[PDB]
Design an enzyme around this catalytic site. Structure first.
Site, PDB file in Angstrom:
ATOM      1  N   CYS B 165       0.807  -1.210   0.000  1.00 41.19           N
ATOM      2  CA  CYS B 165       0.000   0.000   0.000  1.00 41.19           C
ATOM      3  C   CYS B 165       0.850   1.275   0.000  1.00 41.19           C
ATOM      4  O   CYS B 165       0.363   2.345  -0.349  1.00 41.19           O
ATOM      5  CB  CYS B 165      -0.960  -0.034   1.196  1.00 41.19           C
ATOM      6  SG  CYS B 165      -2.284  -1.275   0.992  1.00 41.19           S
ATOM      7  N   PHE B 216     -10.615  -3.528   0.257  1.00 44.13           N
ATOM      8  CA  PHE B 216      -9.743  -3.622  -0.943  1.00 44.13           C
ATOM      9  C   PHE B 216     -10.575  -3.673  -2.230  1.00 44.13           C
ATOM     10  O   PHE B 216     -11.484  -4.504  -2.335  1.00 44.13           O
ATOM     11  CB  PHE B 216      -8.851  -4.855  -0.852  1.00 44.13           C
ATOM     12  CG  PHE B 216      -7.786  -4.787   0.215  1.00 44.13           C
ATOM     13  CD1 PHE B 216      -6.797  -3.814   0.165  1.00 44.13           C
ATOM     14  CD2 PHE B 216      -7.741  -5.720   1.241  1.00 44.13           C
ATOM     15  CE1 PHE B 216      -5.804  -3.761   1.130  1.00 44.13           C
ATOM     16  CE2 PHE B 216      -6.750  -5.667   2.208  1.00 44.13           C
ATOM     17  CZ  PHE B 216      -5.783  -4.687   2.151  1.00 44.13           C
ATOM     18  N   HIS B 303      -2.898   7.857   1.887  1.00 44.59           N
ATOM     19  CA  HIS B 303      -3.415   6.518   1.502  1.00 44.59           C
ATOM     20  C   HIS B 303      -4.552   6.184   2.460  1.00 44.59           C
ATOM     21  O   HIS B 303      -4.345   6.156   3.668  1.00 44.59           O
ATOM     22  CB  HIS B 303      -2.350   5.409   1.471  1.00 44.59           C
ATOM     23  CG  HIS B 303      -2.949   4.071   1.178  1.00 44.59           C
ATOM     24  ND1 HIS B 303      -3.261   3.668  -0.107  1.00 44.59           N
ATOM     25  CD2 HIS B 303      -3.361   3.076   2.000  1.00 44.59           C
ATOM     26  CE1 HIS B 303      -3.823   2.472  -0.065  1.00 44.59           C
ATOM     27  NE2 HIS B 303      -3.892   2.081   1.221  1.00 44.59           N
ATOM     28  N   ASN B 336     -10.195   0.955  -1.019  1.00 48.66           N
ATOM     29  CA  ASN B 336      -8.726   0.819  -0.842  1.00 48.66           C
ATOM     30  C   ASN B 336      -8.153   0.065  -2.051  1.00 48.66           C
ATOM     31  O   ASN B 336      -8.209  -1.183  -2.044  1.00 48.66           O
ATOM     32  CB  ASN B 336      -8.379   0.133   0.485  1.00 48.66           C
ATOM     33  CG  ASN B 336      -6.893   0.149   0.786  1.00 48.66           C
ATOM     34  OD1 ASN B 336      -6.063   0.199  -0.124  1.00 48.66           O
ATOM     35  ND2 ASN B 336      -6.539   0.116   2.060  1.00 48.66           N
TER      36      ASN B 336
END
Lengths: 389, 389
Positions: B165, B216, B303, B336
């Site tokens: 990530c 995700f 992020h 994500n």
């Protein structure tokens, strides 16, 4: 006064060429003789039945021009893990449990010798490149090694997983830029390879995969790269110019798939043919600009994928047999250690030059070339400057 | 006249700082509502019978501040690859078969858009960075993209597999040096992430597996980076200053292992707690040398690991709720998407800056920060200069 982005840039950049300041190398403890590998390989894979195939494997080991190889795998570890001795049994997890621990251990050994040679505080390392073709994990081998060496936690890391045989050039092409664009940057570069991911028993069917069981070996190398050497740092070679290219007519020549059975290798097409047919082009693009046409007048470090590449290059170009000496020596003593190989050869070149008291770290010559070959089919070229002794 | 390495280096280097000249993004076509996902996910996984666990998941999805995500995976593909739908079954060869083809097709879509925006010929790309966390192959996704885009065979590739990530920071940090050290160098960067590799059924024992299945999503992003912009190039942001650091007391916090059952994420420790505690440090490191201590006076790209991370960072620094709009928008609209996420957010920021006629590509502010968070626990910092709109 206002701080401009342009003023920051002039102040943040190093001045001079990227310079290799140390080399360390390392292998696992179990040494394996090529002379008796066939008897050993076919015994420990319960493959004695396949007799006509064994005689082919003898010819392969006989033509290999490898005296011996070091391996993390031994007969003990194989009995504890017979799935790895099958040609194609589910075995990735057993293989991953080996290499995830072991790749950064072998890496650390090499790093320690490079750092000792460099002889500066490990705290002065700004950047870490870690390269392997043996397994993958998160965090990566780069982190494991940061912990093992206890580098500053704010070291800038570049984990280069699953690249293959050309990556020895790839790590020098990367290190070159990190050093040259960063004042006080000191780059630690580690290639660590373990054939535990690749080892399997034989079959008649895929002959290509049996060539690998005869050439591939384990090894780690580390280098320190930086620009603007201090008087108390000892330069070995300068990184001058770099290129990566994909050879034409080369699709699917060297393939590597990481599967449930571990890492598989597939050759189609004549790799030696492909490399030798295309090698002068790479030399011309590197050396014409410098006004160099005589390839016998530069020193040589070429990834020894097998003995055929080296022979067909030599024959094509008309290299004297001397030029491949350092390359052929590492092949004989260690075999194909994938990404690590060219870094070992670079050490072999330095050691020989000191030993026979020659004028430079590069067999008494000023300019040199380093070549990695691997999947694509990829050629990596690095032009080098020797340092005077 | 005799060519000197110092004279070569003067000729060979760029002058000015690394400049983002383009951004393009792509997603797979199948879109997935978060409102309904808990029923979808429990059905196709033949596990509606696990009814208390479904309530935990409904509650996770509710707390996620994700409207929707995109998925290569759909109903047809799962029904025809049922090994993926288990919690633990030999499923890796199925997932590799998918993502080795797919991860680079998706990357090509994003790259094509970035190239169009940049407005130069693709023959003038000199370096490619390809970044994913979804399968591996030799040759790699980098060679696969070079072939699909028909870039020059002698393009310099940097294949970054399996970092997770924080890698959207890592790819800007890398590109900054490639561009700044090489005259004429134009860098294509591509992050491409497909969750086919990590998607699995749920169980009670591993409640951390499940958070992932709720956060995700899939997506690719590309940027062009280069120094010394031509009059006909269009700068978007300057890359000023980069850092990577591992956080104290963070050992084991985010783990990822590639096994026969696929990629598996693990969680120890409190990830939002560790990031919030340590972030001000990273900002003082980045911004004090520039005389900046008011973090409301800079533009943000964080992020979005989850809402928790963003929620606690904002709480700890006292940030006006406006600073994290751009970030929360990509989370809401896409989820994500690992390495790509921060590149989507950078584009979103420039997008919203134009829509609302703001003075600069960074919400009217001159100075910005991009933060990558991932396994380590690693934190990337990238200081950005915006451009007058």
């Amino acid at each position: 006064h206002m701080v401009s982005v342009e003023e920051i840039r002039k102040a943040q950049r190093a001045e001079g060429p990227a310079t290799v300041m140390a080399i360390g190398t390392a292998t696992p403890p179990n040494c394996v003789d090529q002379s008796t590998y066939p008897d050993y390989y076919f015994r420990i894979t319960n493959s004695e039945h396949m007799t006509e195939l064994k005689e082919k494997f003898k010819r392969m080991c006989d033509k290999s021009m490898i005296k011996k190889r070091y391996m993390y795998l031994n007969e003990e570890i194989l009995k504890e893990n017979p799935s790895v001795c099958a040609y194609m049994a589910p075995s990735l997890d057993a293989r991953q449990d080996m290499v995830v621990v072991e790749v950064p251990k072998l890496g650390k050994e090499a790093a320690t010798k490079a750092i000792k040679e460099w002889g500066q505080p490990k705290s002065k390392i700004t950047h870490l490149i870690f390269c392997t073709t043996s397994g993958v994990d998160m965090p990566g081998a780069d982190y494991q090694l940061t912990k093992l060496l206890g580098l500053r936690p704010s070291v800038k890391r570049y984990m280069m997983y699953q690249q293959g045989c050309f990556a020895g050039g790839t790590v020098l092409r990367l290190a070159k830029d990190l050093a040259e664009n960063n004042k006080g940057a000191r780059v630690l570069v580690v290639c660590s390879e373990i054939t535990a991911v690749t080892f399997r028993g034989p079959t008649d069917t895929h002959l290509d995969s049996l060539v690998g069981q005869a050439l591939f070996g384990d090894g780690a190398a580390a280098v320190i790269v930086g620009s603007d050497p201090l008087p108390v740092e000892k330069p070995l070679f300068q990184l001058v110019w770099t290129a990566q290219t994909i050879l034409p007519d080369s699709e699917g020549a060297i393939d590597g798939h990481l599967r449930e059975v571990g890492l598989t290798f597939h050759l189609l097409k004549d790799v030696p043919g492909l490399i030798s047919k295309n090698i002068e082009k790479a030399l011309v693009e590197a050396f014409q600009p410098l006004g160099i046409s005589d390839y016998n007048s530069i020193f040589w470090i070429a990834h020894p994928g097998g003995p055929a590449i080296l022979d067909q290059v030599e024959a094509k170009l008309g290299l004297k047999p001397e030029k491949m000496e350092a390359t052929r020596h590492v092949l004989s003593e260690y075999g194909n250690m994938s990404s690590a190989c060219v870094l070992f050869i670079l050490d072999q070149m330095r050691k020989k030059s000191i030993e026979n008291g020659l004028g430079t770290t590069g067999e008494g010559l000023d300019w040199g070339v380093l070549f990695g070959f691997g999947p694509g089919l990829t050629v990596e070229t690095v032009v080098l400057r020797s340092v005077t002794l």
